[PDB]
RNA sequence: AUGUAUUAAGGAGAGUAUAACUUAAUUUAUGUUUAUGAUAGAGGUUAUCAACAUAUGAACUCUUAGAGAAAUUACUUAAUAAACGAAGUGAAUUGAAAUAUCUUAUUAACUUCAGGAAAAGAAAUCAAACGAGAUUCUAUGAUUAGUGUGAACGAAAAUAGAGCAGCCUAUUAAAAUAAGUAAAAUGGCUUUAAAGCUGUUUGAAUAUUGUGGG
RNA sequence: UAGAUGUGCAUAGUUAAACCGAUCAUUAAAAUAAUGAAUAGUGUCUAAAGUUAGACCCGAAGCCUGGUGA
RNA sequence: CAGUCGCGUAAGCGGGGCAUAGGAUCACAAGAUACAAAAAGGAAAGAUCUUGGAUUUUUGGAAAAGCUACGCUAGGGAUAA
């Protein structure tokens, strides 16, 4: 999220490691539909491969 | 015959009430002294503590200065004071804390368990009974002991007298070897009775039995459920692909 | 008398203990089998030492290299595959996959980098089966099809072969499709399973892709080729003619 | 010797009921249970013939105000060892059957700083086309990959066990997301040539709508 | 109850190595032309051993670091 | 034995010299081989075969001067006073 006043790209609140622990913890209780868009989402990982491939 | 019968008795009266059938590879194995030896000796290496320790010349206290000059004094040239040749020097190859336990194949350890269980079966020293294998202590004594009227000195003095005269009538006491009672769970009357009168036998829990404990007394008095769980946990060599394990031939006449 | 006082190991198991330095009559007395005042008596000689003469590995040198990238296949022959079916340890009616080849014991208790089907005993093999392995010899591919069976060579790794035995990955004889006309159907399947299954990897390197791209190995990527097309990703079949 | 639990500043001088400990050197009170305990008397020096639990009086001098030849002076309700930890500096014996690179060795030692522990820590991490998901401790992986003329030195992924915890609104108060920085040349360190540390001289870019590191 | 999990060795040989495979390697194309290599392992105990550790025991002169003493 | 060349009518001979007196590995360099390529496509650095430069002349392959009557230690006394 680029800051308006400072023009600096604030690092995401949850790091890519922690984003994978939320997607892995949410998928255990069937709550993966409530998390916002994440590259670690199991559906995003699969969709990106089928769409574009290697 | 492939299978061998096992008569189940009622413990107090020893009345044959049921008949079970086990395979010959469970209670009719040949007597292998070499395999029974490896197992009994494999259990002794595990119960050993092996904490003995000794100080070498590199651990004995003191300074590592040279005692006497290399030459000039006329006496034998000496180095440090912690050498084994000195009075308070260290033992070179002395004991040290290490592990004495050895290894024994699970299949060879199970064959040794069923060989010690068959050595008792063929000699008639394996007396299986029904469940609830506890000493039938008199009801009056149990009512007084639980109530608290009886002091400890009398509560113990009675258990010792009754267990001695109860085991002598059965020819199961010190005058005839001894007996070992193996039960699944801990029963107060039994385990407490053989804690005050130990000369008449002992009691053990299924998990507290070794191959050396089956061979250490005159007789083995085991429960039906205990035996079915004892031979079912030590048939690794057999169950590899079943055999008769508790097959009932004559049912208890309810 | 007592049993515990009458046990012992067979005499053939016990051997003499040689305690050196315990008298002349023992036979290992003063010198302790060391000789008389040499280097082997006072100290220790380096094992690699030859007295000064250069070793042959320094006079000739080490020959070759050790390939650290080669795959460690789990060799499987047809002579042994037929024995497991006659014994009832492998169901020939169902597809024989690495999960059922590793759990049966035919290849052993070690999961290596793959499974290759070889052609030992290919003359007495007449059981129609549907097997799937990582590789197969030329004599094992035609021996499986001569009896009326089907064989397919898929791409596996050491990690993917372990997930198949653990049930963390479902086996499939097809590669992952590519394109936007497959997302709706592939994503549909994932939700229905109601579990987190891992996907089997597809080849990425040139050699790996080419091996499973030709029909000679019955590769599962052979359907991507045209009859005149070659498996190699670089070379092409030249055209015969005068022009 | 190992394991478990608990605890986290140590010593000396002199004096004193010689089991009793501080010039008060055997203080004074509470509650409970007392032979079915706990684990119908004699006895205050002919003593402490009562254990548990909770309180309580007193507790000198030096180390340890300043000075000095510590336990003195002179004043005053002046007061904290060792081992363990991090960083800095950094050998030699030894092996290579000599010996320079190397090994011994990110060792011993010393120096500073800090706490009951410290350090480290929630990926500019590893993986390889599948994915894993902070740090620390133990074993395997591994006399392996690799390095080196050699002698020798020596990972990581992963697996198992001990513990498990995540966050910035950190349960104790911290960022308006990082510029002389990343990086380059050169001199060294570490090491496999990468990554990492560094003196000198120089010197970038701004997010997957593909900017930056590996 | 049910399913999974936890080092390893052997089951296939061959070459420097992969491909290959009861066949493989050299023969700059291949081919019985020649030559070599093919079939019970694994665990445990008792004993003797190789390797690395003080390494069967005792014994130097010396070298380095930190301190002490006029 | 395979490959393919010379000489000879032919048989056949030829893998230097009538015989006996010219050292490897490592590194480095020039050709071939198509083996492996540390995410992947290449490459670098490796691997096989052929070959070259050596008083590597201590020629099974260290880059190497002396003194000690002030000498030290461990030994032998291969005779050294
Ligand atoms: K010997
Ligand atoms: K001698
Ligand atoms: K040398
Ligand atoms: K190596
Ligand atoms: K670097
Ligand atoms: Mg010393
Ligand atoms: Mg001693
Ligand atoms: Mg033993
Ligand atoms: Mg012998
Ligand atoms: Mg002799
Ligand atoms: Mg000898
Ligand atoms: Mg000798
Ligand atoms: Mg030499
Ligand atoms: Mg002072
Ligand atoms: Mg003072
Ligand atoms: Mg390790
Ligand atoms: Mg940043
Ligand atoms: Mg830098
Ligand atoms: Mg880079
Ligand atoms: Mg960097
Ligand atoms: Mg092999
Ligand atoms: Mg590459
Ligand atoms: Mg790379
Ligand atoms: Mg020579
Ligand atoms: Mg010679
Ligand atoms: Mg002589």
Give the helix/strand (H/E) hosting B223.
strand B219-223
Q: Give the pairing of strands B219-223 and B179-183.
A: parallel
Q: Is B188 exposed, middle or buried (0-12, 13-18, 19+ CB in 10 A)?
A: exposed
C-alpha dist (Å) from residue C145 to B81, B105, B190, C134: 84, 45, 71, 17
Contacts of C4 in chain B (CB under 8 A): 40, 212, 215-216
Neighbours of ion ligand 11 (CB under 5 A): C 33
Q: Hunting for tokens 């294998």 — which residue is that?
A: B133
Q: Give the count of beta carbons closer than 10 Å to the beta carbon of residue C119.
A: 19
C-alpha dist (Å) from residue B78 to B57, B64, B162, B244: 14, 12, 71, 75
Q: Give which of B254, B2, B1, B26 is closest to B130, Cα–Cα.
A: B254
Q: What is the four-CA torsion angle of B17, B23, B28, B32, rounded to 10 degrees?
A: -140
What's the CA gap between C48 and C58, in Å, rounded? 12
CA C65 to chain centre: 21
What's the CA gap between A19 and A27, in Å, rounded? 12
Cβ atoms of B135 and B163 within 8 Å: the answer is: yes
What's the CA gap between B218 and B215, in Å, rounded? 8
Give the helix/strand (H/E) hosting B23.
strand B16-23
What's the CA gap between B111 and B240, in Å, rounded? 14
Q: Hunting for tokens 């990690």 — which residue is that?
A: C159
Cβ atoms of B95 and B52 within 8 Å: the answer is: yes
- Are B37 and C9 a contacting pair at CB < 8 A? yes
Spatial CB neighbours of A36, under 8 Å, sequence gap ≥ 6: none
Give the helix/strand (H/E) hosting B234.
none
Q: Give the count of beta carbons closer than 10 Å to the beta carbon of residue B59.
A: 11
For residue B69, which nucleotide's C1' is closest to its Cα? E60
Q: Does B181 touch chain C (CB under 8 A)?
A: no
Provide Rg for chain A, Cα atoms: 14
Give the resolution in Å.
3.0
Q: CA nearest C202 in A: which residue?
A: A54
Give SS3 for C80: helix
User: Which residues of B66-148 form beta strands (DSSP E)?
Assistant: 126-129
Give SS3 for C182: coil
Q: How far apart are the first and last CA of chain B?
A: 29
Give the helix/strand (H/E) hosting B140.
helix B139-147
Helix A42-52 and helix C183-193: axis angle, to 10°?
150
CA angle C164, C168, C171 (to 5 degrees): 45
Q: Tell me the Ramachandran region of residue C61: left when phi exceeds 0, alpha when psi lies from -120 to 50, beta otherwise.
A: left
Q: Which residues of C153-182 are buried (b: 16+ CB within 10 A; e: fewer)?
A: bbbbeeebbebbeeeebebeeebbeeeeee
Q: Hunting for tokens 């020293």 — which residue is that?
A: B125
Cβ atoms of B4 and B124 within 8 Å: the answer is: no
| Beta partners for residue B3, in sequence order | B23
Q: Give which of B48, B3, B29 is closest to B110, Cα–Cα.
A: B29
Q: Give which of C104, C112, C97, C110 is closest to C164, Cα–Cα.
A: C97
Handedness of CA B142, B145, B150, B156 (dihedral sign): positive
Cβ atoms of C220 and C175 within 8 Å: the answer is: yes
Helix C78-86 and helix C138-146: axis angle, to 10°?
40
Q: Hunting for tokens 């035996």 — which residue is that?
A: B227
For residue C205, which nucleotide's C1' is closest to its Cα? F40
What's the CA gap between B207 and B234, in Å, rounded? 13
Q: Hunting for tokens 């169902």 — which residue is that?
A: C94
What's the CA gap between A5 and C46, in Å, rounded? 73
- Are B215 and C4 a contacting pair at CB < 8 A? yes
What's the CA gap between C66 and B226, in Å, rounded? 58
Spatial CB neighbours of B167, under 8 Å, sequence gap ≥ 6: B173, B174, B179, B197, B200, B201
- Are C202 and A54 a contacting pair at CB < 8 A? yes
Give SS3 for C74: strand
Cβ atoms of B224 and B8 within 8 Å: the answer is: yes
What's the CA gap between B127 and B176, in Å, rounded? 15
Cβ atoms of B36 and C7 within 8 Å: the answer is: yes
- Are C3 and B34 a contacting pair at CB < 8 A? no
What's the CA gap between B137 and B139, in Å, rounded? 6
Give the helix/strand (H/E) hosting B36.
helix B33-47
User: Which residues of B44-198 form beta strands (DSSP E)?
Assistant: 126-129, 179-183
Cβ atoms of B88 and B2 within 8 Å: the answer is: no
- Reading the block at residue B139, the tokens are 């009801």
What's the CA gap between C196 and A39, in Å, rounded? 17
Q: Give which of C151, C135, C212 is closest to C232, Cα–Cα.
A: C212
Q: Is B26 exposed, middle or buried (0-12, 13-18, 19+ CB in 10 A)?
A: buried
Q: Does B34 touch chain C (CB under 8 A)?
A: yes
Q: Which residues of A34-43 are buried (b: 16+ CB within 10 A; e: fewer)?
A: ebeebebbbe
Give SS3 for B117: helix
Q: How was this structure determined?
A: cryo-EM
Contacts of B210 in chain C (CB under 8 A): none
Q: Give which of B254, B204, B214, B219 is closest to B234, Cα–Cα.
A: B214
Give SS3 for C76: strand
Handedness of CA C176, C180, C182, C184 (dihedral sign): positive
What's the CA gap between C23 and C29, in Å, rounded? 4
Q: Is B231 exposed, middle or buried (0-12, 13-18, 19+ CB in 10 A)?
A: buried
- The sheet carrying B179-183 orders its strands as B201-205, B179-183, B219-223, B126-129, B3-9, B16-23, B245-250
Q: Give which of C214, C123, C132, C125 is closest to C173, Cα–Cα.
A: C132
Q: CA nearest C14 in B: which residue?
A: B34
Q: Give the count of beta carbons closer than 10 Å to the beta carbon of residue C91.
A: 13
Give SS3 for B45: helix
What's the CA gap between B153 and B157, in Å, rounded? 6
| Beta partners for residue C130, in sequence order | C150
What's the CA gap between C151 and C161, in Å, rounded? 18
DSSP C51: B
Q: Is B80 exposed, middle or buried (0-12, 13-18, 19+ CB in 10 A)?
A: middle
CA B8 to chain centre: 23
- Which residues does C contribute to its contact with B (CB < 8 Å)? 3-4, 6-10, 13
| Beta partners for residue B183, in sequence order | B205
Q: Give the count of beta carbons closer than 10 Å to the beta carbon of residue C40.
A: 10
Q: Is C87 exposed, middle or buried (0-12, 13-18, 19+ CB in 10 A)?
A: exposed
DSSP C241: S
Give SS3 for B40: helix
Spatial CB neighbours of C148, under 8 Å, sequence gap ≥ 6: C128
What's the CA gap between B161 and B164, in Å, rounded? 5
What's the CA gap between C191 and A17, in Å, rounded? 24
């Amino acid at each position: 999220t680029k800051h308006p006043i400072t023009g600096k790209w604030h690092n995401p609140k949850y790091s890519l490691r922690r984003q994978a622990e939320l997607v892995k913890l949410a998928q255990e209780h069937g709550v993966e539909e409530l998390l916002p868009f994440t590259r670690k989402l199991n559906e995003e990982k699969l969709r990106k491969r089928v769409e574009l491939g290697l | 015959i492939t299978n061998v019968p096992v008569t189940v008795y009622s413990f107090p009266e020893l009345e044959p009430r049921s008949l079970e059938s086990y395979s010959a590879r469970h209670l009719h194995l040949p007597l292998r002294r070499d395999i029974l030896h490896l197992a009994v000796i494999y259990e002794g290496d595990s119960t050993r503590r092996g904490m003995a320790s000794t100080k070498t010349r590199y651990e004995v206290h003191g300074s590592h200065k040279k005692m006497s000059p290399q030459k000039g004094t006329g006496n034998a040239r000496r180095g440090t004071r912690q050498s084994p040749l000195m009075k308070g020097g260290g033992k070179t190859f002395g004991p040290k804390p290490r592990d004495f336990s050895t290894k024994l194949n699970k299949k060879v350890y199970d064959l040794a368990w069923r060989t010690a269980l068959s050595y008792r079966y063929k000699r008639g020293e394996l007396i299986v009974t029904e469940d609830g294998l506890d000493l039938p202590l008199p009801n009056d004594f149990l009512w007084l002991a639980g109530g608290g009227k009886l002091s400890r000195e009398l509560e113990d003095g009675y258990v010792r007298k009754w267990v001695h005269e109860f085991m002598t009538s059965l020819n199961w006491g010190k005058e005839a070897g001894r007996t070992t009672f193996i039960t699944g769970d801990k029963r107060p009357n039994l385990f407490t009775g053989f804690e005050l009168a130990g000369a008449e036998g002992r009691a053990l829990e299924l998990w507290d039995v070794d191959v050396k404990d089956l061979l250490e007394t005159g007789r083995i008095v085991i429960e039906r459920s205990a035996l079915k769980e004892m031979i079912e946990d030590h048939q690794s060599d057999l169950v590899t692909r079943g055999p008769n394990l508790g097959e009932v031939l004559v049912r208890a006449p309810r | 008398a007592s049993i515990l006082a009458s046990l012992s190991d067979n005499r053939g198991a016990y051997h003499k203990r040689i305690r050196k330095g315990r008298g002349p009559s023992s036979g290992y007395g003063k010198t302790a089998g060391r000789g008389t005042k040499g280097q082997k008596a006072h100290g220790h000689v380096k094992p690699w030492f030859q007295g000064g003469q250069t070793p042959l590995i320094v006079s000739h040198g080490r020959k070759g290299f050790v390939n650290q990238f080669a795959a460690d296949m789990s060799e499987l022959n047809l002579e042994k595959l037929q024995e497991w079916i006659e014994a009832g340890r492998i169901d020939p009616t169902k597809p024989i996959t690495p999960k059922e080849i590793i759990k049966s014991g035919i290849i052993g208790s070690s999961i290596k980098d793959g499974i290759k089907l070889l052609g030992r005993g290919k003359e007495s093999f007449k059981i129609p089966v549907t097997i799937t392995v990582s590789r197969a010899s030329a004599s094992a591919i035609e021996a499986i099809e001569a009896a009326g069976g089907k064989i397919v060579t898929r791409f596996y790794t050491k990690e993917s072969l372990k997930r198949l035995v653990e049930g963390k990955s479902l086996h499939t004889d097809k590669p992952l499709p590519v394109g936007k006309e497959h997302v709706e159907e592939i994503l549909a399947q994932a939700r229905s399973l109601k579990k987190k299954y891992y996907r089997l990897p597809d080849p990425t390197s040139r050699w790996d892709i080419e091996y499973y791209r030709d029909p000679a190995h019955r590769g599962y990527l052979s359907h991507q080729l045209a009859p005149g097309e070659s498996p190699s990703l670089y070379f092409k079949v030249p055209t015969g003619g005068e022009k």
